[PDB]
Amino acid sequence: GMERGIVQYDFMAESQDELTIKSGDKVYILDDKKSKDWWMCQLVDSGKSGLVPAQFIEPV
Ligand code: NA
Ligand SMILES: [Pt+2]
């Protein structure tokens, strides 16, 4: 089912749609087609989801 990624650099959500992430975190990439710039991700460990800037995520 799930496309995976690894977070490269810390990012703090500034808007309610965004997801705060830490360098090294594992995510699921829920969508990367609506925008090359904003990907919807879900943290494996917490289950929280939101948008992150795409350059913060390295697909696995
Ligand atoms: Na994209
Ligand atoms: Pt901050």
Side-chain angles (χ1 to χ4, degrees):
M2 308 307 279
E3 289 288 351
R4 301 180 187 82
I6 303 291
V7 172
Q8 305 195 257
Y9 329 109
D10 298 357
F11 171 78
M12 187 179 287
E14 287 272 60
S15 175
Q16 298 166 277
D17 60 320
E18 296 169 13
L19 183 64
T20 290
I21 57 186
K22 182 190 172 190
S23 186
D25 279 348
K26 295 171 56 176
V27 295
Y28 299 122
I29 304 170
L30 302 186
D31 177 66
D32 57 3
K33 296 202 292 206
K34 290 179 182 67
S35 174
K36 288 169 197 285
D37 298 327
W38 292 97
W39 293 355
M40 185 77 73
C41 292
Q42 183 176 32
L43 280 158
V44 173
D45 282 355
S46 69
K48 198 177 181 83
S49 58
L51 293 177
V52 304
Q55 69 271 69
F56 285 73
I57 309 302
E58 174 190 345
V60 179

